[PDB]
Write a protein that binds this ligand. Structure first.
Ligand SMILES: CCCCCCCCCCCCCCCCCCOC[C@@H](O)COP(=O)(O)OCC[N+](C)(C)C
Ligand SMILES: CCCCCCCCCCCCCCCCCCOC[C@@H](O)COP(=O)(O)OCC[N+](C)(C)C
Ligand SMILES: CC(C)CCC[C@@H](C)[C@H]1CC[C@H]2[C@@H]3CC=C4C[C@@H](O)CC[C@]4(C)[C@H]3CC[C@]12C
Ligand SMILES: CC(C)CCC[C@@H](C)[C@H]1CC[C@H]2[C@@H]3CC=C4C[C@@H](O)CC[C@]4(C)[C@H]3CC[C@]12C
Lengths: 105, 31, 115, 36, 121, 38, 122, 29
């Protein structure tokens, strides 16, 4: 009875008994047909929430899939040594600028 | 991807301070 | 089998390389170039190396209940630090170098003239 | 191809450009001091 | 109704069940029991959370579910569906963050220069 | 086209590192004269 | 004991077999006999090399064995995984390559600036 | 295309700023 999140080449889908609802999260590209809703790109990080009711075989049931996707195309991998070097040399350069301004004044 | 936007983000300062310097140079000279 | 127990699984959606030992026994001693590196971790059969961007190498044996497995050499050459030596890049590099040298030379010339 | 590192390299390049601008300012400032 | 809270600080992924805070809770990952048995340190049930270490995308991505201790686990109504590309010491920032850093750095540089200028005289 | 961006980024990184080193050399050159002047 | 020495230049990948000095030598890539025929692009194994032209990361990569004719492929003492990425005339930067350009640049800049200064003194 | 043109903009702006500051300092003198 759990909602079968189905993965295409670049799309996600949601299936349940009643019309695929929307309570919170991303809306996506709505399709008028029941049990078939695509959010579009997986890169947009789908994070929608789709409550639902029970089916005929499973009456008075509830399948709340809080579908969460984190495939970040904008992530970075910080390098601590590089960050420390950049910070230290920026501090040194700012100190030297202050030295020059003081020497002038 | 961050796209080629941070390069122009840095170039903004080099563009604006150059024309500020032009403004000061024209204010003090000629006119 | 042919005593080739070590294998590599790749093409995963994440970036990493892993070693799978196909020995039907527990406490299978891993190696790296004839040396003790790390004892087997029980309940898991996939020793970990790291990321493919690091360019892992070396031969990895796998000593099970029977004799040692034949080590599996690994080679990776993913370009992380590869630059492009086309026609444009060299011209840009030389032009920037020449302009900077000329500007510094003019500055130090004026410094000499003053002092 | 994984873009998780290319963004880090772009950030490093931006930081290097900022430091280059600061160093140019320092050298100009001190030469001007030598001239004044 | 209240959504789950997934926090990813590095490779460590912590999943918190916000629907049964008062009662003791145990976790199940795809209809099978996970955590709470203290079998390893990679998985571990905290006071009200499930702590997952060395996270992977093929395994450990599925219908996580939390059920109260001493209750029926099968009649579960809330199934988190998680698919995460988790990596060590990685963050998320767009152009706005680096723009903030650049502008603020200009700010401290200018402020410090003016401060030394006014203190020198 | 991500590979092209990678190549351009590393090329710019090395070029600006070289420019920073040149600036450091010039800073030493001017600092010696400034210290010997005052 | 004697590992595969693989040297990659440009967009072409060539790897060696310093394990059989002189003998007829065959190759296999993903359990498919690679080489021979008449070089549908240069893939044919050389005397002790297999040089690839227009190397494709996704299509041409995997387990490479180096065994002679009349021998079962399982008799090799070690397999090899080749997962390489190539591009048009790119080069890497090792530590000894970065430190070469850094030192050369510093020396040439210092020398030229000192020459200009000591010329402009008078 | 974009990065090379932006770096060209960087270089030309740096040179122009240097030249104009050098010209301004004579004028105020
Ligand atoms: C970044 C550029 C900073 C330039 C600071 C430039 C600071 O200039 C200070 C001078 O105007 C002081 O002149 P007097 O000694 O007459 O007072
Ligand atoms: C890009 C790098 C920018 C660096 C800026 C450094 C800027 C360094 O400026 C130094 C000032 O003392 C120059 O002031 P004036 O040009 O007004 O002096 C004219 C002469 N009298 C009027 C004072 C006698
Ligand atoms: C692009 C570069 C040149 C920008 C540098 C900073 C510009 C915006 C500002 C910062 C401090 C300014 C200087 C501060 C003080 C003086 C002394 C005054 O009697 C004439 C103008 C002059 C000389 C200003 C010229 C413009 C100046 C150099
Ligand atoms: C970018 C670095 C490497 C070099 C910068 C050189 C700059 C700082 C130098 C080059 C020539 C110099 C000028 C030479 C002569 C004069 C005339 C004098 O009455 C006022 C100062 C003034 C106007 C100098 C100001 C500083 C100056 C513009």
């Amino acid at each position: 009875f759990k909602i079968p999140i189905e993965e295409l080449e670049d799309r996600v889908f949601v299936n349940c008994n009643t019309s695929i609802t929307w309570v919170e999260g991303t809306v996506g590209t709505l399709l008028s047909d029941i049990t078939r809703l695509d959010l579009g790109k997986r890169i947009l990080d789908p994070r929608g929430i789709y409550r639902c009711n029970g089916t005929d075989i499973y009456k008075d049931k509830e399948s709340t899939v809080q579908v969460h996707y984190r495939m970040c195309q904008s992530c970075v991998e910080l390098d601590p040594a590089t960050v420390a070097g950049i910070i230290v040399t920026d501090v040194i350069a700012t100190l030297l600028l202050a030295l020059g301004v003081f020497c002038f004044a | 991807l961050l796209d080629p936007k941070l390069c122009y983000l840095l170039d903004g300062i080099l563009f604006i301070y150059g024309v500020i310097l032009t403004a000061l140079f024209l204010r003090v000279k000629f006119s | 089998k042919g005593n080739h127990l070590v294998k590599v699984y790749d093409y995963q959606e994440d970036g990493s390389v892993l070693l799978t030992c196909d020995a039907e026994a527990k406490n299978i001693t891993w190696f790296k170039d004839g040396k003790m590196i790390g004892f087997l971790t029980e309940d898991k059969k996939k020793w970990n190396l790291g990321s493919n961007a690091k360019d892992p190498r070396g031969m990895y044996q796998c000593k099970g209940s029977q004799n040692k497995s034949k080590p599996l050499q690994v080679y990776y050459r993913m370009c992380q630090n590869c630059i492009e030596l086309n026609a444009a890049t060299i011209s840009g590099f030389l032009f920037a170098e020449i302009v900077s040298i000329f500007v510094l030379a003019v500055g130090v010339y004026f410094i000499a003239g003053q002092d | 191809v994984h873009t998780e590192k290319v963004n880090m390299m772009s950030l490093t390049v931006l930081g290097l450009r900022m430091l280059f601008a600061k160093t140019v300012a320092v050298n100009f400032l001190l030469t001007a001091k030598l001239f004044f | 109704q209240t959504p789950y809270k997934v926090s990813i600080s590095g490779t460590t992924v912590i999943l918190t069940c916000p629907q049964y805070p008062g009662s003791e809770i145990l976790w199940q990952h795809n209809d099978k029991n996970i955590g709470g048995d203290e079998d390893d340190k990679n998985i571990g049930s905290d006071e009200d959370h499930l702590s997952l270490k060395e996270f992977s995308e093929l395994e450990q991505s599925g219908y996580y579910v939390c059920y109260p201790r001493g209750s029926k686990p099968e009649d579960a109504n809330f199934y988190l569906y998680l698919r995460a590309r988790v990596c060590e010491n990685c963050m998320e920032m767009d152009v706005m963050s680096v723009a903030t850093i650049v502008i603020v750095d200009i700010c401290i540089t200018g402020g410090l220069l003016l401060l030394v200028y006014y203190w020198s005289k | 086209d991500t590979l092209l961006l990678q190549l351009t980024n590393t090329s710019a990184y090395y070029m600006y590192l070289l420019l920073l080193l040149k600036s450091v050399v010039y800073f030493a050159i001017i600092t010696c004269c400034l210290l010997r002047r005052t």
